[PDB]
Write a protein that binds this DNA or RNA. Structure first.
Ligand SMILES: [Mg+2]
Ligand SMILES: [Mg+2]
Ligand SMILES: [Zn+2]
Lengths: 81, 246, 49
RNA sequence: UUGACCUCAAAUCAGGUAGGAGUACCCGCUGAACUUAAGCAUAUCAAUAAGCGGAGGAAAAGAAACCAACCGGGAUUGC
RNA sequence: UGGUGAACUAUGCCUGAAUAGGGUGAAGCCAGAGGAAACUCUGGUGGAGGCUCGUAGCGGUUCUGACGUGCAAAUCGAUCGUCGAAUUUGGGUAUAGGGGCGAAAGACUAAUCGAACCAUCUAGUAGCUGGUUCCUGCCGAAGUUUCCCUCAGGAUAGCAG
RNA sequence: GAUGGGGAAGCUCCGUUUCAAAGGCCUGAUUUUAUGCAGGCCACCAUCGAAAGGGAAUCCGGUUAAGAUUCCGGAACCUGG
RNA sequence: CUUGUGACGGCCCGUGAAAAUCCACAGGAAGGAAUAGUUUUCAUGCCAGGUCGUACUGAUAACCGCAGCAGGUCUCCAAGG
RNA sequence: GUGAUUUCUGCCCAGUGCUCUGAAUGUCAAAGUGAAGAAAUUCAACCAAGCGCGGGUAAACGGCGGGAGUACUCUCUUAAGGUAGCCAAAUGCCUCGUCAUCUAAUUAGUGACGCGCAUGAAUGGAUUAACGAGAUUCCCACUGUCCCUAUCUAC
RNA sequence: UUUACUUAUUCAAUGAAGCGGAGCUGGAAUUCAUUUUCCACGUUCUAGCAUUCAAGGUCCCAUUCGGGGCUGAUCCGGGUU
RNA sequence: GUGGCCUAUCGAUCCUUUAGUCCCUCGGAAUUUGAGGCUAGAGGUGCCAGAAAAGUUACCACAGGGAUAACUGGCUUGUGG
């Protein structure tokens, strides 16, 4: 009974939500996220996972400060009014 | 081939010793000043059972000579020690059972136990139940003592090493048959995960050197060289002789 | 090379144990048979004469 | 006793700086096998892919412990 | 090559929990009797055992029953093994892929195991199988020679344009 | 599972009291006063880990379409000050 | 009958957690009364008790098995013959 | 490794392993030493462990033969030659072995026999109470398994 | 090949507490002139107790509430053993 | 008369080595060792136009094959009847 009766015993999560990415990939016993690598300082990325890099790279979010850097450069980082 | 069972034992994943119900390391009192210039008197408060150990332990209380407090040491109980007995530890201690005299100050034929190898490691030799060390001879110049060990070997150790006079309590245990796989289960359940033992000749050849074949047989000789490597040392390692002698 | 090993592992030993261990290891029979082979080496010359 | 020197510390001491992201191109380390040899082990793939460390608008290299053998040339880079 | 899994399951640890009613009647003890003494006998008491019949529970022997495009990628029915322990089990925790764990079947490691899964190298290689897209006109074969780890393949000569 | 350390080219690995100068505790004293200087005491030595282990203290009656040992009425208890 | 508990008895080469936390004792540091104090482990009296969860199912239809699947999934209460 | 108890575990160290505190130039690396050379280099001596020589070891892996004479003895071969036990056994080709028993009839079962293709002693041998969803034979009871089929209910 | 030496290196313990040398004070000791040495150098019927820079002695201070130094508890070398 | 009366009686590249020329080269210039070349032999591939090479799989896998076995059918009928 490795199929249907064994699927009834599944009610204990191995992963919960992660703090940096909100992914539900944070392993409870390992205390590590399997997608972004929290709590390591570097973010988990691999050159074989180029599509995953495309999924989580810069520009897939809000860019709350980086949207204005090109415009401030074009104006020359001016000050005043 | 796979990694065999005795090869897997050294990682210590499930092969660590079960130490939940143990009462502390049974060591001798440290050799500070009193034990090497005079003696010191302590008291046996209780004799208790140690989990996974065949011998009982003794809880001996001394006074700290430098601070107002009490020290509690765990000795291995000698056969004949009772609760409320005064235990004397030191160079000038009188020769009675339970006392912790150094080996330079006991005569020929003395039976001691919990013997230090070097002066100060707080007990190494003859600690299992019913075992003892006999003093075979002295050597004052180049101050050493010869001792007979429980294995029958004769060691030559320092005369400043200490030992508890008498034999370890709880002797004669292995004379009783266990009679039951349940009894062996409860015996090893508090020691470590090394039981039950599957024979390697009953395995598959991926799992052991002895495994495989259309009959259960070893194949090559079971005596293994000392220069063999891990994964090969399964059998009788470096056997000088085999068989039942008559 | 042999003398290093005796200093390494047989320094603390007495002659009763030494005789017991060489009798249990069977080298004493080899020494006996080597001296015996010397004895028939002399003895065959004596029988020839 | 007092005052130096040397060395080593402590401060939510005064002021600073490093980490992470990106990584097409750049500077290094580490490092395969599929494949080809009509098999295969040196070889090849390849001083490559994957992995790790570190920069900039370029980086690196760069003003000879050079090339030459000629009636000698003259930093580096690229075609 | 680099990562992800012990939510199933294997094993150890830590902390909890669960297990009707019967049968047999072990030590210890009490009374009576006998004996010269050792000690024996009889009647009770007591309630031992990896004992036994048998529920809940755990498992899965047979019908090679049902079903077999099923209720179900392993179930249903009857018959069964076991049922106070080497028992069953929750949660926490540890062991990760030539590695783990195994009362040992090459078993189990998320329906995947005589080496898991994911992505990349990778459009891996194939003397082997299958396919290969409009018309008309003209010419029109070979299965033979020699060499090859050659015998389902090539080179070379021949035949053809 | 950090730190002190020690490996590792490195991502990181070991170790958890270790070859560390590892800290805070009460009385107060002073009443330019702030909290130093009077003192004296103590050496564990991060932290995480149980909604079934340990653990301060609440019960009854009534009430809603849907909440209650939590609201209402009454009657208690514990902790800190 | 279910359950709680007490005093016992049997078993073991099995003798069947730890820490936070609270109390007591030994000790005698120090502070202390006579026109006055000393005591808040006695009684009464005063103030405050933050944050998050709290509905419902828990299974032949609320979970997992592609589903409103005869499967699987821990536990408490338990009337009469 | 073997697998409760009882009773035993015979012979063989030649081979393959394992192991010696033996004896010591046979094999004999790098470094080092010596000679020749102008040097690169060449040639020798010396030379650690391990091999090689000498022992031990079978509850180590394993093995347990032939020819004559009268079960016995002798002789060869080899390291030693199957001991105690057991058997057409789950191990026997021939084989449906031979004898007895069980039946009307038995390639099945059981008890014996043993030149046993190719049984055999911790590769464990023989025996064995109790136990077994283990394999096999016979007997009593019992029955639609069958002679030989018929009928009824629910879906 | 044997054999010193310790500071490199290595192992172990401790909250780095009693190391080494010399000296007292006793005992043995035979001294052949005066001491050569060697052992000691506060604890053993009893499941109590042992802590407040220590009492005492002594010397200062400015007496008072007390405070400090030496000794009690032998010197010397800072090599934790 | 350019081996055996005739028809069989044998071997590439790379590497090593020998003989000859004592000839050519070691590329800044020479001498001498050393090395590399040219011409002709030898050391050998017997699977003989010339890979350096043990098994097992009843746990097995892939690409194919009726070019190829284990059934029936078909031809034949030795053998059988
Ligand atoms: Mg186990
Ligand atoms: Mg085998
Ligand atoms: Zn994350």
């Amino acid at each position: 009974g490795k199929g249907t009766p064994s699927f009834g015993k599944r009610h204990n999560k191995s992963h919960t939500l992660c703090n940096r990415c909100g992914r539900r990939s944070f392993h409870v016993q390992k205390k590590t996220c399997s997608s972004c690598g929290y709590p390591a300082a570097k973010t988990r990325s691999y050159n074989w996972g180029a599509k995953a890099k495309r999924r989580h790279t810069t520009g897939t979010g809000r860019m709350r400060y980086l949207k204005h850097v090109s415009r401030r450069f074009k104006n020359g980082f001016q000050t005043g009014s | 081939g796979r990694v065999i069972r005795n090869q897997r034992k050294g990682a210590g994943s499930i092969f660590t010793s079960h130490t939940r119900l143990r009462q502390g390391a049974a060591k001798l009192r440290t050799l500070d000043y009193a034990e090497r210039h005079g003696y010191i008197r302590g008291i046996v408060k209780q004799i208790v059972h140690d989990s996974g150990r065949g011998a009982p332990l003794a809880k001996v209380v001394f006074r700290d000579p430098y601070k107002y407090r009490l020290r509690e040491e765990i000795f291995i109980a000698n056969e004949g020690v009772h609760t409320g007995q005064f235990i004397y530890a030191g160079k000038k201690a009188s020769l009675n059972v339970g006392n912790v005299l150094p080996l330079g100050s006991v005569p020929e034929g003395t039976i001691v136990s919990n013997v230090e190898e070097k002066p100060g490691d707080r007990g190494a030799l003859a600690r299992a139940s019913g075992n003892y060390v006999i003093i075979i001879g002295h050597n004052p110049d180049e101050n050493k003592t010869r001792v007979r060990l429980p294995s029958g070997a004769k060691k030559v150790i320092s005369s400043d090493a200490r030992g508890v006079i008498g034999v370890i309590a709880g002797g004669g245990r292995v004379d009783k048959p266990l009679l039951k796989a349940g009894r062996a289960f409860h015996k090893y359940r508090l020691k470590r995960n090394s039981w039950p033992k599957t024979r390697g000749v009953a395995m598959n050849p991926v799992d052991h050197p002895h495994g495989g074949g259309n009959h259960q047989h070893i194949g090559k000789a079971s005596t293994i060289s000392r220069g063999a490597v891990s994964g090969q040392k399964a059998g009788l390692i470096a056997a000088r002789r085999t068989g039942l002698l008559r | 090379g042999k003398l290093k090993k005796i200093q390494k592992k047989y320094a603390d030993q007495d002659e009763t144990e030494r005789l017991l261990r060489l009798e249990a290891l069977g080298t004493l029979k080899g020494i006996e048979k080597q001296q015996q082979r010397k004895k028939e080496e002399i003895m065959k010359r004596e029988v020839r004469e």
